[PDB]
Amino acid sequence: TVGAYLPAVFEEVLDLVDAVILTEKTALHLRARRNFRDFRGVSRRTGEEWLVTVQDTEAHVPDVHEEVLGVVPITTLGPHNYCVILDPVGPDGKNQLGQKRVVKGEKSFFLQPGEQLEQGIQDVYVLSEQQGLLLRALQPLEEGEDEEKVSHQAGDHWLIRGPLEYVPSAKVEVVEERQAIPLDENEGIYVQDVKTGK
Amino acid sequence: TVGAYLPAVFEEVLDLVDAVILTEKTALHLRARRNFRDFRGVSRRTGEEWLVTVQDTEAHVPDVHEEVLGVVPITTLGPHNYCVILDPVGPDGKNQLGQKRVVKGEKSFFLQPGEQLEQGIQDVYVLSEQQGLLLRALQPLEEGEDEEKVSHQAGDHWLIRGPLEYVPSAKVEVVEERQAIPLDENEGIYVQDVKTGK
């Protein structure tokens, strides 16, 4: 209640609490102290953590049943950026521990409690026709970039080449970047097909 | 109220507040302190920021529900200038974080809260027929400068040449400036087409 508030006889006044302003680039990280219901009207459990954003309130006052863990800055990715989220939050709202999620493109989001970037904000691989990527699979994967479907086994190497932008998948590890060798006519190199040795 | 104002018994007078004169080359940056309605008659939210220009008031007095963040000088571009706006304000009034907007020509505007110039005021590329630009794409882009449409892939290089003024696009990165080689008859150079090596 705004204004002059008179304490009662049996109500020890401790301190004033001020709300936290939530800008579009910031969010509030709160851990519940006990079972209660917040302002939006959803029940909580002890130790459970969640985020409060501008879409809820412009300013949020830290409740006694809540704990301020810190302000979470937004993570923004340009069109030339991608990132890997460690332990992404699944449909059930619980972290999928061990797994990873790859986020690409122009996207802005908050790292939900538990989630973490594998290495930070990374830039996608944009390659010309004189450049190429040697990269090996780590699990049997399917990728229908074109109309047809190409399948790879858990150890299959293959080369990505051409004018295109490539973002590494979760099951794909990049081995080596390749550059074409400019050869004039009547010039050449000796290449050994190590699979057969020829 | 202009003139001599007598304070009441319960109204502690603190200080005088003077309005801010808004010239056409200046604007006022205000962050709301709480939910209220300003002089124009639009509601605000805590922490929300906006701009006040000459088209609103010649002079604006800083309200108690508002915070003076600073005077925003105008950004003016000549006909030979262009700039890139980091995090432009979209149709919804919120910053499009990560993206960029390219502004070209004779234009005057104010950097809205959140927006920022990538490198400042830049001059466009004006080229003669003895000059050229080598520049690579970064995303699949379409540009109908002529009647036909030319499409480029994410790694395609191509050369811009001729008497023309060029402003770099958001998806286009300039690689190198080229100059024609003046050759007399019975003179020449050895050029290697690195794509094929011939």
B48, B32 contact by CB (below 8 A): yes
Compare CB distances from A183 to B97, B98, B197 and report the shortest one's residue.
Answer: B197
Collapse the DSSP code of A111 into the 3-class scheme (helix H, G, I; strand E, B; otherwise coil) and give the result: coil
What is the identity of the amino acid at A139?
Q
B103, B114 contact by CB (below 8 A): no
In angstroms, the CA B188 to CA B198 distance is 16
CB atoms closer than 10 angstroms to residue B84: 17
User: In chain A, what's the furthest Cα-to-Cα distance?
Assistant: 101
Residue B86 phi, psi dihedral angles, 5° rounding: -75, 130
CA atoms within 13 A on the CB side of A58: 13
In angstroms, the CA A159 to CA A168 distance is 13
Resolution in A: 3.1
Q: What is the DSSP code (8-state) at residue A58? A: S
Contact residues, chain A to chain B, C-beta under 8 Å: 19, 21-25, 58-59, 74, 76-81, 106-108, 126-131, 162-165, 180, 182-185, 187
Q: Do A106 and B94 touch (CB under 8 A)?
A: no
Determination method here?
cryo-EM
Q: What is the DSSP code (8-state) at residue A59? A: E
Contacts A161 to B, Cβ<8 Å: none
Q: What is the DSSP code (8-state) at residue A185? A: T
Sole residue written with tokens 């972290």: A95
Sole residue written with tokens 């908050």: A110
- Which of A128, A145, A183, A185 is the mutation pick for testing B, counting most B CBs within 10 A? A128
CB atoms closer than 10 angstroms to residue B198: 11
